[PDB]
Amino acid sequence: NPNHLSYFKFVGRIVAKAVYDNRLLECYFTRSFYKHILGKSVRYTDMESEDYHFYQGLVYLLENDVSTLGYDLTFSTEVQEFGVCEVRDLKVTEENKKEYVHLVCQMRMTGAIRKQLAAFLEGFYEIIPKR
Q1: Interatomic CA distance for residues 107 and 117, integer angstroms
Q2: How many CB atoms lie within 10 A of CB 89?
Q3: Taking a C-beta distance cutoff of 8 angstroms, is the pair 128, 37 a contact?
Q4: Shortest CA distance to 129 belongs to which of 22, 19, 41?
Q5: How far is the C-alpha of 46 from the C-alpha of 109, rounded, in Å?
Q6: What is the DSSP string of 54-99?
Q7: How far apart are the first and last CA of the chain?
Q8: H or E element in which residue 122 lies
Q9: How far out from the chain centre does Cα 89 lie?
Q10: CA dist., res. 128 & res. 121, Å (int)
Q11: What is the CA radius of gyration of the chain?
Q12: 29 torsion bin: left (phi>0), alpha (psi -120 to 50), beta (else)
């Protein structure tokens, strides 16, 4: 949809209007999307429902030595956004992975939806103050 961001801003407005009216909608958003609407980081356990095989990749990165990979990785990942696939930087070591798993999960959740999300948040915060 070429106007889709505007419709995402409309649905963010309608959600914030339902909240303002104190009326219940049958929305059941992900914990990731609720955190984004709250400005909270996601956690790797959220990946289990959205992309189990990437969660499993992160779990193979956790509690395992980088030496188990047998090849190197860096802070860059392939992301499909708007049907275009691009390799995007996130900014590897035993110190960096703590951020890789946080940051890579940020990229995987928001990167492909970041503009829809910004439109939704503009619709929401227009009517309901973020704080």
Answers
A1: 13
A2: 10
A3: no
A4: 19
A5: 9
A6: HHHHHHHHTTS-GGGTSS---SEEEEEETTEEEEEE----TTTHHH
A7: 32
A8: helix 114-127
A9: 15
A10: 10
A11: 17
A12: beta
Tokens 């709250």 appear where? 38
Distance CA 117, CA 36 (A): 8
Q: From the centroid of its chain, how far is CA 21?
A: 28
**Which experimental technique did the depositors report for determining this structure?**
cryo-EM
The alpha helices in 22-51, defined as continuous H runs, are 31-38, 44-50
As a whole number of angstroms, the distance between CA 8 and CA 4 comes to 6
Q: Show the CA angle centred on residue 11, arms to residues 7 and 12, nearest 5°.
A: 115
Q: In Å, what resolution does this model reach? A: 3.4
Paired with 45 in beta bridges are none
Residue pair 79/86 in contact (Cβ under 8 Å)? The answer is yes
How do beta strands 76-81 and 84-89 pair?
antiparallel
DSSP lists the bridge partners of residue 94 as none
From the number of C-beta atoms within 10 Å of its C-beta (0-12, 13-18, 19+), residue 108 rates as buried
Query: Tokens for 27?
Result: 């929305």
